[PDB]
Design a protein around this nucleic acid. Structure first.
Lengths: 143, 62, 138, 72, 189, 144, 101
RNA sequence: ACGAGACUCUGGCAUGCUAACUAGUUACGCGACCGGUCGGCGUAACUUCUUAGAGGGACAAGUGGCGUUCAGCCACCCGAGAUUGAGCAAUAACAGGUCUGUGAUGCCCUUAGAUGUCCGGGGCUGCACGCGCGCUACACUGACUGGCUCAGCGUGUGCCUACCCUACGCCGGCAGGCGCGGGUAACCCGUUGAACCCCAUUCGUGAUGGGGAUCGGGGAUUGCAAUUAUUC
């Protein structure tokens, strides 16, 4: 439960190294999807006291957090609350950790150019998605 | 750096390039017989007292 | 009894109903010791303890307030209290001590009896504010 | 820039902190943080915990101005 | 009784400038329980000095387009550091305040003088009103920069600057500004 | 003279009505209370685990103050500063669903009664409980 | 019920008051208990229009304001008596809405 | 003599006066305390508390210091007020913009081969950068759980005008379905319970909570037609 000495710098994702200085409800922002109000709500309903700090981060805490982030239905959390609802190019519903599998889905530039779609060409040149009109004004990129 | 007293008795006018200062006549309380002119900076009321480093200073005079 | 004679500041006003009661001052169902900003309570106890807490000897004063802004209500709620005290002290009881306390609170300040005639002016077009104008284009 | 501060529980929050905050006359989370090399956030947390222990005299409380003085 | 905030005594102040109590006043009958009376002195002239200087402070550490329109915050933040100087020096904050206003208050400044030239400056005497204005401005500038981006909160940076300006200590930013004004008065006769 | 409803600081009064609520243990909480956005102008998830009970306390207190006032009005009280980044911040409504759910929670428990022209009122039992709570806080320090 | 309400509205205060005085005298010419004229808040309508037809020059606007002043006269009488009083060559620009309940 | 001034609405004292049932606080119980306190409000109800009327009031009128001792200027007591803010604004004129504001108009293309015209499916909806009005910030006078609670001009169901505000039950975090109704209007939202602030929550000098500024999915209401998730 409470223990003065459990401070470790690294959490396990794909054997890579992360930061471990942030406090609780903020130390699990190192995961791509977890963080913001997602980590806040999982710690809020985790039935633990939130006054704990980085040094009192127990291994049971981390194990339960990893299990809860594996599947959202621990407290009946719908999939859209995660960054990835029903996936593109496959019929899954979850976000995948690490790199090389989720980022493979994001590359969306060639196939839309096959149908001569505007979205794919826009993402092909690295242009604006929000639709920022460009006439002459703008102070980013070349100076 | 002796310091004495000086109090306003006559606001002679406003000076400065853009109305910076007031050319004002001041008497020394410790002597109550001398009147000197000072380009005092800031809002000045007729009868205020101020501690000064200078007891003989004069500025541009017309 | 209604010897109320306004008591105002900005667009907010107070009416100080006064009667022969308990000596407790009420502000629309809440005591003057507890007001929403939680900061101007001293501004409200200023008149009474300036003139004397001993003056209230069975006088029930209920002030009803209405207008915009909390601090705008204050400086008028207390003005209404002072007006009600003036009306009570002018109706029957003497004037020598009335003039004494009046001189004391007048030298204390001026916003206890006479209202501030100030008010928010209109805004003039061709600028962001009433007096401020847009930046010049070179 | 670079966030790197003391987040470890060791002989810095109890010793030299509970032994040097009571002996000083002004106690503030900023004052405790500056004079005792400690983090202001953990200074506030520990001050709240010791107030729950009941070893101070409180004048008023605020988000940035919690007024403490020695009582015992 | 007319004690400030009902806790700081007002029958103890001594300006010790022979005749300056009409331009720096905290004993005057305009001095009230609180430094909040809304702005009424700025309209006319030489009425600004009739202000209770507590109000001039709570409005001078009240600036910079992020504070304007938040005067109750200024009154809370002056209650803060009033009850803090009550313990730091163990004396009434009004005494250290009048010491700061009597030392930080400049005497000599340098200004452009002449109708036909622009080469140099001339020494001028800064009147009591302008001297208190610019002294409080330097105090507030230091107190803003002393807690700007810093871990140090308000009511302590202001407190530190006030205490080390009230004793005449040159370590203060306001007192170093005063020394700079005096030296530029020396160097432009 | 007894004790009036508003003669004790209203912050601790709503705290004490909330305390009555969590010593009663009568209310019900549905299973969509942590999966929703629950706000527009609030940019962080609640850190107190108990906002439902404080919401019930606020709703009950406002209910004593306002007669005939029903759902849709407290959500404007619970709305606030909505910042859109570059866009200037506006006033946005809070969560209507949260207020409605807390109302239905308090609805039918002899605290909240359904009026006949729209909105809601309070039953004498609810008013008596609120007045007992106010007397409790007053007797804590203000009546001794 | 026989409480006849005249909701009378006009742009001019003086013409409105002359109409009200004539109507209340015609009621006072007969044996009719009446209430005083009830002055509902005048509607001030603002229209701020750019002056230059094509955008050029300093940003200049006209501010046309429309003051609509409305009185009500509710008298305890059958509406036929009020209509008998009505044929008095009502002032132009003063419109009458008749309310019977 | 025109202009300025004067004028008019006014901001600001109507405690005096015509006077409300679309305004409002106090003569007896409605759910509680041996006398005090409710905007579901108590039987009873007076213009003080909001609107909008007439008359009054402020004049450098009063005192003091200056002044060619005048016109005037500066201080002071009373007083609500001793410079409230704006629309009107001259003689005379421009080669300043508008023929892309107009069913007000001058030879050229336009003489029916009619730069939209019946239908209507792209167009000022482009990327390398220069101080064009402005936008949220760089933080601890603070964004931030939420406690308490105060607004004023207004705008509002309707001629080829659905669509305007918008009091509850059910559901739906997000917009929204049906109903009993409330609104031509101070009657209905409204007591614009609002909104800025009232500082009990991780916050501590950072890339996380100042800084949504830069990703892909989904419910969907006015919109046949949201393709640059234009806008919830």
């Amino acid at each position: 439960l409470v223990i003065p000495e459990k401070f470790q710098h690294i959490l396990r994702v794909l054997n890579t190294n992360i930061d471990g200085r942030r406090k609780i409800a903020f130390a699990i922002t190192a995961i791509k999807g977890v963080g913001r109000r997602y980590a806040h709500v999982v710690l809020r309903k985790a039935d633990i006291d939130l006054t704990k700090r980085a040094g009192e981060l127990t291994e049971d805490e981390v194990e339960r957090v990893i299990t809860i982030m594996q599947n959202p239905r621990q407290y009946k959390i719908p999939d859209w609350f995660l960054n990835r609802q029903k996936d593109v190019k496959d019929g899954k519903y979850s976000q995948v950790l690490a790199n090389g599998l989720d980022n493979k889905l994001r590359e969306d530039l060639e196939r839309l150019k096959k149908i001569r779609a505007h979205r794919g060409l826009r993402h092909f040149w690295g242009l604006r998605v929000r639709g920022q009109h460009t006439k002459t004004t703008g102070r980013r990129g070349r100076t | 750096q002796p310091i004495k007293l000086a109090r306003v008795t006559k606001v002679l006018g406003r000076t400065g390039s853009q109305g910076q200062c007031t050319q004002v006549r001041v008497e020394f309380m410790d002597d109550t017989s001398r009147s000197i002119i000072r380009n005092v900076k800031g809002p000045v009321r007729e009868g205020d007292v101020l501690t000064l480093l200078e007891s003989e200073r004069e500025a541009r005079r017309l | 009894q209604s010897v109320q004679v306004f008591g105002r500041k900005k667009t907010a006003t107070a009416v100080a109903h006064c009667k022969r009661g308990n000596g407790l001052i009420k502000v629309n169902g809440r005591p003057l010791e507890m007001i929403e900003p939680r900061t101007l309570q001293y501004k409200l106890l200023e008149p009474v303890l300036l003139l004397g807490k001993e003056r209230f000897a069975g006088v029930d004063i209920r002030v009803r307030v209405k207008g915009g802004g909390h601090v705008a209500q204050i400086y008028a709620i207390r003005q209404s209290i002072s007006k009600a005290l003036v009306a009570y002290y002018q109706k029957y009881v003497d004037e020598a001590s009335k003039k004494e306390i009046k001189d004391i609170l007048i030298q204390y300040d001026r916003t206890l009896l006479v209202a501030d005639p100030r008010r928010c002016e209109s805004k003039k077009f061709g600028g962001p504010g009433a007096r401020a104008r847009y930046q010049k284009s070179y | 820039d670079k966030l790197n501060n003391l987040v470890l529980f060791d002989k810095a929050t109890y010793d030299k902190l509970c032994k040097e905050v009571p002996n000083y006359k002004l106690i503030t989370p900023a004052v405790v943080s500056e004079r005792l090399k400690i983090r202001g956030s953990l200074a506030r947390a520990a001050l709240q915990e010791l107030l729950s222990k009941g070893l101070i005299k409180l004048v008023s409380k605020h988000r940035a101005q919690v007024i403490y003085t020695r009582n015992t | 009784d007319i004690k400030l905030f009902g806790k700081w005594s007002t029958d103890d102040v001594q300006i010790n400038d022979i005749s300056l109590q009409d331009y720096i006043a905290v004993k005057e009958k305009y001095a009230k329980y609180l430094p909040h009376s809304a702005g009424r002195y700025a309209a006319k002239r030489f009425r600004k000095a009739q202000c209770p200087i507590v109000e001039r402070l709570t409005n001078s550490m009240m600036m910079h387009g992020r504070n304007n329109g938040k005067k109750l915050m200024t009154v809370r933040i002056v209650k803060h550091a009033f009850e803090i100087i009550h313990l730091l020096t163990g004396e009434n904050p009004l005494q250290v305040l009048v010491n700061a206003i009597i030392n930080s208050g400049p005497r000599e400044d340098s200004t452009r003088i002449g109708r036909a030239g622009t080469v140099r400056r001339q020494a001028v005497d800064v009147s009591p009103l302008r001297r208190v204005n610019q002294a409080i401005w330097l105090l507030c500038t230091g107190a803003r920069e002393a807690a700007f981006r810093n871990i140090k909160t308000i009511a302590e940076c202001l407190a530190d600057e006030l205490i080390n300006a009230a004793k005449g200590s040159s370590n203060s930013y306001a007192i170093k500004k005063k020394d700079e004004l005096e030296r530029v008065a020396k160097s432009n006769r | 003279p007894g004790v009036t409803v508003k003669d004790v600081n209203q912050q601790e009064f709503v705290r004490a009505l909330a305390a009555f609520l969590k010593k009663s243990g009568k209310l019900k909480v549905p299973e969509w209370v942590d999966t929703v956005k629950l706000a527009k102008h609030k940019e962080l998830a609640p850190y107190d685990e108990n906002w439902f009970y404080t919401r019930a306390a606020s709703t009950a207190r406002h209910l004593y103050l306002r007669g005939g006032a029903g759902v849709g009005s407290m959500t404007k009280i619970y709305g606030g500063r909505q910042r859109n980044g570059v866009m200037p911040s506006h006033f946005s409504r809070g969560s209507k669903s949260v207020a409605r759910r807390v109302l239905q929670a308090l609805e039918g428990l002899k605290m909240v009664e359904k009026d006949q022209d729209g909105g809601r009122k309070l039953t004498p039992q609810g008013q008596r409980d609120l007045d007992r709570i106010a007397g409790q806080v007053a007797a804590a320090n203000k009546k001794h | 019920i026989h409480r006849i309400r005249i909701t009378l509205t006009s742009r001019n205060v003086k013409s409105l008051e002359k109409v009200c005085a004539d109507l209340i005298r015609g009621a006072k010419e007969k044996n009719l208990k009446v209430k005083g004229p009830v002055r509902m808040p005048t509607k001030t309508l603002r229209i701020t229009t750019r002056k230059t037809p094509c955008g050029e020059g300093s940003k200049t606007w006209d501010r046309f304001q429309m003051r609509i002043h409305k009185r009500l006269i509710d008298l305890h009488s059958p509406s036929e008596i009020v209509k008998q009083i009505t044929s008095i060559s009502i002032e132009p620009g003063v419109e009458v809405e008749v309310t019977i309940a």
